Amino acid sequence: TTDGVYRVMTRRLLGSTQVGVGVMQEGVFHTMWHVTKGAALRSGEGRLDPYWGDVKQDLVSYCGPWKLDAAWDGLSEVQLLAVPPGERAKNIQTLPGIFKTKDGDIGAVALDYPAGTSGSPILDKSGRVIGLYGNGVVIKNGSYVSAITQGKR
Amino acid sequence: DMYIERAGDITWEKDAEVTGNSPRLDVALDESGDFSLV
Ligand SMILES: CNC1Cc2ccccc2C1
Helix, strand or coil: CCCEEEEEEECCCCCCEEEEEEEEECCEEEECHHHHCCCCEEECCEEECEEEEECCCCEEEECCCCCCCCCCCCCCCEEEEECCCCCCCEEEEECCEEEEECCEEEEEECCCCCHHHCCCEEECCCCCEEEECCCEEECCCCCEEEECECCCC | CEEEEEEECCCCCCCCEECCCCCEEEEEECCCCCEEEC
8 A cells, every 4th residue: 555656467367467557646546447447456455446437538546536636847858657567667758749639738758668557657857646658649650659647636 | 356566666767768759749539538640
């Protein structure tokens, strides 16, 4: 239950497989819906039950409501704390681009990691989580760009 | 059945590697939560 970044694992496939990542903050676990499909999670001998989720936002929280409310400032570089399958956590600094939608603008990071890295946090210079990595699009040249996906608190 | 394993603290790293560009893209988000290019 300590604050920090966590791997989401399953043993129902061959070996142990990392299906994603998430953030423990203020007693609540935060990840992307497509990682868990809203299923319960085990932490040691304890169980974490889903509390809130939304397929369209592609987010889910466990044990309480969504706690992360920092937002990209629109101007400064950020850091992806990528936690790739089988690999040490590592910070990658980048200047976000922008997803333009009919409903407004969203920051986006042009960084490409395995699908199991979904749910890794994106941070501002104060260390606050401004969103989660892993819901995005493939652009004309074939590379991957993730929205900075943030919930509501 | 899914389980979680701690991987680190959430902190800004002062001398992190810098990379990636900054594309401005028109996108649409469908009811299934999938983004597409416009
Ligand atoms: C083709 N994408 C690569 C990017 C990456 C980074 C760490 C580990 C694995 C991989 C797959």
